[PDB]
Amino acid sequence: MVSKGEELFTGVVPILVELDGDVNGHKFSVSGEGEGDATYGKLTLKFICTTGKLPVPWPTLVTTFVTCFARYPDHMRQHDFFKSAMPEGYVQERTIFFKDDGNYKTRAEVKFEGDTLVNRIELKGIDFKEDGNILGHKLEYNYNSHNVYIMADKQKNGIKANFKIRHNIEDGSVQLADHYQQNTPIGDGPVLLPDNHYLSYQSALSKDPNEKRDHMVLLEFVTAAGITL
Numbered sequence: 001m002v003s004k005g006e007e008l009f010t011g012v013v014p015i016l017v018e019l020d021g022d023v024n025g026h027k028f029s030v031s032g033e034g035e036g037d038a039t040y041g042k043l044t045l046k047f048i049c050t051t052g053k054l055p056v057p058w059p060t061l062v063t064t065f066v067t068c069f070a071r072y073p074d075h076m077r078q079h080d081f082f083k084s085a086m087p088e089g090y091v092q093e094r095t096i097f098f099k100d101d102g103n104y105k106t107r108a109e110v111k112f113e114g115d116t117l118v119n120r121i122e123l124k125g126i127d128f129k130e131d132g133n134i135l136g137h138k139l140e141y142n143y144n145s146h147n148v149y150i151m152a153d154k155q156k157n158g159i160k161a162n163f164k165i166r167h168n169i170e171d172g173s174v175q176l177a178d179h180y181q182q183n184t185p186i187g188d189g190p191v192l193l194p195d196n197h198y199l200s201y202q203s204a205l206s207k208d209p210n211e212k213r214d215h216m217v218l219l220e221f222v223t224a225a226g227i228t229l
């Protein structure tokens with residue numbers, strides 16, 4: 001049968017993203033709009049910095065900017081925590097440690113507001129170097145593919161993950177961003193606690209040639225894979 005959560009994602013769903021950020025005291029806000037199509041694990045979003053110039057590189061915000069849109073293969077459906085929490089939603093919390101630099105702490109509430117899937121985020125960054133790779137804008141405007149290992153977090157009735165993102169720098173090295181993540185349901189209703197599995201991500205960053213505001217266009221695909229060999 002199709003679950004309550006699953007039924008909400010059978011077609012194309014509008015997405016709204018709102019982020020309020022503060023990195024080393026530099027305040028900024030971002031709004032995003034687009035659509036998700038979970039049947040294909042597909043996200044298409046455009047983000048605009050509504051406060052002027054973004055004080056950090058756009059790529060550093062990609063992981064922060066709706067895992068309920070992942071494609072879970074039929075045989076994997078029992079491991080989809082994210083849709084199972086809907087429509088009431090879930091909270092995603094992360095700490096993102098940029099190696100040899102500062103860290104972000106994020107809290108996101110992901111839930112439906114009517115027919116729109118909303119990702120409401122607060123981000124605080126501390127201990128950044130004003131001339132490091134982040135505040136110095138030394139990251140390439142691109143993005144690598146990554147696999148994320150999802151684990152149940154029984155004590156929190158949710159899931160957790162840790163994974164390392166590699167942001168390419170033009171000197172050929174990378175800026176590592178070490179992510180630690182915990183997700184908790186917003187409702188007190190039932191959720192699916194998964195066995196360990198992977199989410200595979202591909203992300204493409206682009207610009208709208210007609211857009212004068214500081215912005216990012218993101219195309220992202222997310223697909224689950226299991227551990228039955």
Ligand SMILES: [Cl-]
Pocket residue numbers: 056057058059141
């Ligand atoms: Cl950028």
Ligand SMILES: [Cl-]
Pocket residue numbers: 066067092183
């Ligand atoms: Cl998530």
Ligand SMILES: [Cl-]
Pocket residue numbers: 172173174175
């Ligand atoms: Cl390196």
